[PDB]
Write an enzyme that holds these catalytic residues in place. Structure first.
Site, PDB file in Angstrom:
ATOM      1  N   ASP A  35       0.812  -1.203   0.000  1.00 33.48           N
ATOM      2  CA  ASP A  35       0.000   0.000   0.000  1.00 33.48           C
ATOM      3  C   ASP A  35       0.854   1.264   0.000  1.00 33.48           C
ATOM      4  O   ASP A  35       1.364   1.670   1.039  1.00 33.48           O
ATOM      5  CB  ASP A  35      -0.914  -0.014   1.226  1.00 33.48           C
ATOM      6  CG  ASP A  35      -1.773   1.218   1.327  1.00 33.48           C
ATOM      7  OD1 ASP A  35      -1.909   1.920   0.301  1.00 33.48           O
ATOM      8  OD2 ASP A  35      -2.305   1.468   2.431  1.00 33.48           O
ATOM      9  N   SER A 199      -0.806  15.618 -12.027  1.00 36.44           N
ATOM     10  CA  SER A 199      -1.040  15.243 -13.406  1.00 36.44           C
ATOM     11  C   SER A 199      -1.299  16.490 -14.236  1.00 36.44           C
ATOM     12  O   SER A 199      -1.848  17.485 -13.739  1.00 36.44           O
ATOM     13  CB  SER A 199      -2.240  14.298 -13.493  1.00 36.44           C
ATOM     14  OG  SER A 199      -2.611  14.041 -14.834  1.00 36.44           O
TER      15      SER A 199
HETATM   16  C1  LIG Z   1      -4.156   5.367   6.622  1.00 35.77           C
HETATM   17  C2  LIG Z   1      -3.569   6.556   5.914  1.00 35.77           C
HETATM   18  C3  LIG Z   1      -2.141   6.727   6.309  1.00 35.77           C
HETATM   19  C4  LIG Z   1      -4.349   7.801   6.290  1.00 35.77           C
HETATM   20  N1  LIG Z   1      -3.564   6.348   4.426  1.00 35.77           N
HETATM   21  C5  LIG Z   1      -4.745   6.115   3.726  1.00 35.77           C
HETATM   22  O1  LIG Z   1      -5.990   5.961   4.132  1.00 35.77           O
HETATM   23  C6  LIG Z   1      -4.503   6.027   2.227  1.00 35.77           C
HETATM   24  C7  LIG Z   1      -3.982   7.354   1.704  1.00 35.77           C
HETATM   25  C8  LIG Z   1      -5.003   8.442   1.477  1.00 35.77           C
HETATM   26  C9  LIG Z   1      -5.450   9.077   2.810  1.00 35.77           C
HETATM   27  C10 LIG Z   1      -6.488  10.118   2.644  1.00 35.77           C
HETATM   28  C11 LIG Z   1      -7.677   9.592   1.859  1.00 35.77           C
HETATM   29  C12 LIG Z   1      -7.265   8.935   0.539  1.00 35.77           C
HETATM   30  C13 LIG Z   1      -6.149   7.923   0.664  1.00 35.77           C
HETATM   31  C14 LIG Z   1      -6.687   6.593   1.225  1.00 35.77           C
HETATM   32  N2  LIG Z   1      -5.643   5.571   1.382  1.00 35.77           N
HETATM   33  C15 LIG Z   1      -6.266   4.312   1.851  1.00 35.77           C
HETATM   34  C16 LIG Z   1      -5.390   3.102   1.710  1.00 35.77           C
HETATM   35  O2  LIG Z   1      -4.377   3.164   2.669  1.00 35.77           O
HETATM   36  C17 LIG Z   1      -6.211   1.829   1.967  1.00 35.77           C
HETATM   37  C18 LIG Z   1      -5.386   0.552   2.096  1.00 35.77           C
HETATM   38  C19 LIG Z   1      -6.290  -0.672   2.365  1.00 35.77           C
HETATM   39  C20 LIG Z   1      -6.048  -1.867   1.685  1.00 35.77           C
HETATM   40  C21 LIG Z   1      -6.855  -2.998   1.915  1.00 35.77           C
HETATM   41  C22 LIG Z   1      -7.893  -2.932   2.824  1.00 35.77           C
HETATM   42  C23 LIG Z   1      -8.137  -1.747   3.508  1.00 35.77           C
HETATM   43  C24 LIG Z   1      -7.329  -0.611   3.275  1.00 35.77           C
HETATM   44  N3  LIG Z   1      -7.284   1.709   0.953  1.00 35.77           N
HETATM   45  C25 LIG Z   1      -8.547   2.157   1.310  1.00 35.77           C
HETATM   46  O3  LIG Z   1      -9.041   2.813   2.365  1.00 35.77           O
HETATM   47  C26 LIG Z   1      -9.592   1.832   0.242  1.00 35.77           C
HETATM   48  C27 LIG Z   1     -10.978   2.430   0.522  1.00 35.77           C
HETATM   49  C28 LIG Z   1     -11.821   2.573  -0.768  1.00 35.77           C
HETATM   50  N4  LIG Z   1     -12.923   1.772  -0.698  1.00 35.77           N
HETATM   51  O4  LIG Z   1     -11.285   3.448  -1.654  1.00 35.77           O
HETATM   52  N5  LIG Z   1      -9.683   0.405   0.053  1.00 35.77           N
HETATM   53  C29 LIG Z   1      -9.839  -0.012  -1.231  1.00 35.77           C
HETATM   54  O5  LIG Z   1      -9.824   0.565  -2.428  1.00 35.77           O
HETATM   55  C30 LIG Z   1     -10.143  -1.513  -1.278  1.00 35.77           C
HETATM   56  C31 LIG Z   1      -9.326  -2.444  -0.623  1.00 35.77           C
HETATM   57  C32 LIG Z   1      -9.638  -3.796  -0.678  1.00 35.77           C
HETATM   58  C33 LIG Z   1     -10.758  -4.220  -1.374  1.00 35.77           C
HETATM   59  C34 LIG Z   1     -11.091  -5.582  -1.436  1.00 35.77           C
HETATM   60  C35 LIG Z   1     -12.219  -5.988  -2.138  1.00 35.77           C
HETATM   61  C36 LIG Z   1     -13.020  -5.063  -2.776  1.00 35.77           C
HETATM   62  C37 LIG Z   1     -12.688  -3.688  -2.721  1.00 35.77           C
HETATM   63  C38 LIG Z   1     -11.567  -3.289  -2.023  1.00 35.77           C
HETATM   64  N6  LIG Z   1     -11.247  -1.941  -1.968  1.00 35.77           N
END
Ligand SMILES: CC(C)(C)NC(=O)[C@@H]1C[C@@H]2CCCC[C@@H]2CN1C[C@@H](O)[C@H](Cc1ccccc1)NC(=O)[C@H](CC(N)=O)NC(=O)c1ccc2ccccc2n1
Length: 330
Positions: A35, A199
């Site tokens: 991630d 971008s």
């Molecule tokens: C925790 C922190 C350091 C704040 N980083 C973040 O939250 C970062 C960086 C940015 C922060 C501000 C908001 C935008 C992004 C989100 N990302 C989220 C990132 O870290 C995180 C990693 C993750 C992987 C697997 C399972 C859970 C979570 N992804 C997410 O929060 C997103 C949420 C979404 N529905 O867009 N998860 C997904 O896109 C996701 C993951 C697994 C899946 C499995 C099956 C079907 C769909 C699936 N969708």
């Protein structure tokens, strides 16, 4: 040194990608979601509340002769969809595709939220954003990449995600056979701890390119491409019957549609996302309404170049003194 590991979609929709990671001695192999949007390496473990484990492979630190409890250290994280996990911390040996880091902080989950429990294919996350975002308290810990960097032949890692197929994460080298043309590098801001870049614009299908600055993050941990409402509306307007559904939670479109491509700019270069990459299938089993892979970032507060965008490119995460991002077609 270098490392090279295959990354595999967890399902037929490429909802996420998992990469095998060796932890401990003897090795315990867990499949982690790499991630670039977060900075914690955390795992399902023998310490995870039993009712919250449903098919995941767990790390058992007591069975690792190299595991050491990091005294007093805890962690707790919440992601973009409100899913969360927390626990304590060990240091242990971690290897990815032949690249080994000793003394890596491995965050052992004591608790995970329902979304994690419900996904049997993801055994934890390996964060590849900047270490400033790591949640370990009271002493913040370094990411796998930060720990490995000095030993690497070059201070880089690359993401080469597949469409409905496996791909590759490489550490320490650029595989010049893995892309076409040249890699275009672009500036990164690390101020928010993300791989944040700008971008240069977009096109929809065979349409004219719109030159416009779109600030966003390269986030391999997010499935979809989240962009400003104006851009997203312009895309879906080209798909007969597409609509933003408040009940579903975004743009949906008839499953019978053939989707147009979407192009994004990297400097003067252009990355083309084929239309098929933007189809995330029926909104519910048996429905003829399909979920779109390009969605509005309105109310997120930031644009997200997630897997939908990144999988159309060979992407270089350059961790030199001044980090940059590189994109090539492939
Ligand atoms: C925790 C922190 C350091 C704040 N980083 C973040 O939250 C970062 C960086 C940015 C922060 C501000 C908001 C935008 C992004 C989100 N990302 C989220 C990132 O870290 C995180 C990693 C993750 C992987 C697997 C399972 C859970 C979570 N992804 C997410 O929060 C997103 C949420 C979404 N529905 O867009 N998860 C997904 O896109 C996701 C993951 C697994 C899946 C499995 C099956 C079907 C769909 C699936 N969708």
């Amino acid at each position: 040194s270098t490392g090279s590991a295959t990354t595999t979609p967890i399902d037929s929709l490429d909802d996420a990608y998992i990469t095998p990671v060796q932890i401990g001695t003897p090795a315990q192999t867990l499949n982690l979601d790499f991630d670039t949007g977060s900075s914690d390496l955390w795992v399902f473990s023998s310490e995870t509340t039993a009712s919250e484990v449903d098919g995941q492979t767990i790390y058992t630190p007591s069975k690792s002769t190299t595991a050491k409890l990091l005294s007093g250290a805890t962690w707790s994280i919440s992601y973009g969809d409100g899913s969360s996990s927390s626990g304590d911390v060990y240091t242990d040996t971690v290897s990815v595709g032949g690249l080994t880091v000793t003394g890596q902080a491995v965050e052992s989950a004591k608790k995970v939220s329902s979304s994690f429990t419900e996904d049997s294919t993801i055994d934890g996350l390996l964060g590849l954003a900047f270490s400033t975002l790591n949640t370990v308290s009271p002493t913040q810990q370094k990411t796998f990449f930060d720990n490995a960097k000095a030993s690497l032949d070059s201070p880089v890692f690359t993401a080469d995600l597949g469409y409905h197929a496996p791909g590759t994460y490489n550490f320490g080298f650029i595989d010049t056979t893995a892309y076409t043309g040249s890699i275009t590098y672009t500036a990164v801001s690390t101020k928010q701890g993300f791989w944040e870049w700008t971008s240069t614009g977009y096109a929809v299908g065979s349409g004219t390119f719109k030159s416009t600055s779109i600030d966003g993050i390269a986030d391999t941990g997010t499935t979809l491409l989240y962009l400003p409402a104006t851009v997203v509306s312009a895309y879906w307007a080209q798909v007969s019957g597409a609509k933003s559904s408040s009940s579903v939670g975004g743009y949906v479109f008839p499953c019978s549609a053939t989707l147009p491509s979407f192009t994004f700019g990297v400097g003067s270069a252009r990355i083309v996302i084929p239309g098929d990459y933007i189809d995330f299938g029926p909104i519910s089993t048996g429905s003829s309404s399909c979920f779109g892979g390009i969605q509005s970032s309105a109310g997120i507060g930031i644009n997200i170049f997630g897997d939908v965008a990144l999988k159309a490119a060979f992407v270089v995460f350059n961790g030199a003194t001044t980090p940059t991002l590189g994109f090539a077609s492939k």
